[PDB]
Amino acid sequence: LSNERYQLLSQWPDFTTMYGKDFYYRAHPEDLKKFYDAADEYYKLYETVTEFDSLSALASQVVPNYAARRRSTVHPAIGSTVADGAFTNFLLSKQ
């Protein structure tokens, strides 16, 4: 999933081609501070999508809630479609 987000930071326009002083001084002083904030934002997004040593601890936030649903008192592989299909056998037979 991090690869699908890294692929859209791959398609980010090269803002460093507009760092020259012929773009600094032709531009509105507030549209240049927005441009320098949008360049500081890409480095925030890119330095956290390449923090791949953080994915191994995000996987441990998914494991314990999944593993408790598998500790079912009925069966590990039980679900609603089977347990509804086995209520049809239980209800539509005699008592």
């Binding site: 326009p13 090269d14 803002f15 507009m18 773009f23 549209d31 441009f35 890409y42």
Partner: protein, 257 residues
């Protein structure tokens, strides 16, 4: 955010296009001196009923009004420039190069031969788009001229005979734009331009020294009212001028006896 950055990059292209169609200077519209009105009717302090200490506070609010009205006239320029470029930002090209990131496929790995050609794209934008071809003397030619001086026997001064060959190319170093030499490009450096400023400061400071030389040869008692405490004395009428220095100036003017 990618669309906001493409909108900002298209806006800063629209600012650069309609400021290079109008051929305007770069620092002109960011300088709020250029939006200042020098032909303003300049209010006279002798018609405003000021008391003794009131004249410098009158001068400050005539200045800071006229400075605020030049800043607020610069803001009205840029707010009208913004809507001119935002109109052309809506009709723009949007063909920008992308940020060089290393290519990473879905389940694959990243080769170091692609991490390195990405790093080559970062260090190929560290070179300037137009640069001085400042020549280093290689050791292949700095020894072929050092020992040629050492075969004649100038091996003791063999250090200085190389440096003049280095500096003679360094001084007439030409600029190159894209590897090719743009020819007929004269630049004024930052050590030349700071020598134009330092001589122009010295030829206006000697007019200030010559101004006060005449005023203190004729009227040497003027050196007892300090320059910062001078317009703290004024008023609108001459009889309202603060008498802190009036009776002292009249007696220093009468001479040393």
């Amino acid at each position: 955010k990618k669309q906001a950055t493409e909108n900002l990059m298209k806006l800063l292209q629209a600012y650069k296009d309609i400021g290079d169609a109008k051929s305007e200077p770069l620092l002109k519209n960011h300088n709020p001196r250029t939006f200042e009105d020098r032909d303003y009717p300049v209010p006279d302090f002798r018609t405003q009923n000021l008391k003794a200490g009131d004249v410098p506070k009158f001068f400050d609010t005539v200045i800071s009004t006229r400075a605020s009205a030049a800043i607020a006239s610069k803001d009205k320029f840029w707010a009208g420039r913004k809507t001119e470029a935002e109109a052309a930002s809506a009709k723009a090209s949007a063909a920008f190069p992308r940020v060089a990131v290393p290519e990473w496929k879905k389940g694959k790995t990243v080769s170091i031969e692609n991490l390195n050609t990405v790093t080559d794209k970062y260090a190929a934008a560290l070179v300037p788009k137009r640069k001085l071809a400042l020549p280093v003397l290689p050791e292949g030619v700095k020894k072929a001229v050092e020992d040629f001086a050492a075969s004649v026997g100038q091996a003791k001064n063999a250090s200085e005979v190389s440096e003049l060959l280095a500096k003679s190319l360094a001084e007439k170093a030409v600029v190159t734009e894209g590897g090719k030499v743009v020819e007929g490009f004269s630049y004024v450096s930052k050590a030349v331009a700071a020598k134009v400023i330092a001589t122009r400061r010295a030829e206006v400071h000697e007019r200030l020294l010559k101004l006060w030389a005449k005023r203190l040869l004729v009227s040497p008692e003027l050196a007892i009212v300090p320059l910062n405490e001078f317009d703290a004395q004024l008023a609108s009428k001459f009889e309202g001028i603060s008498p802190k220095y009036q009776e002292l100036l009249s007696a220093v003017a009468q001479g040393n006896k």
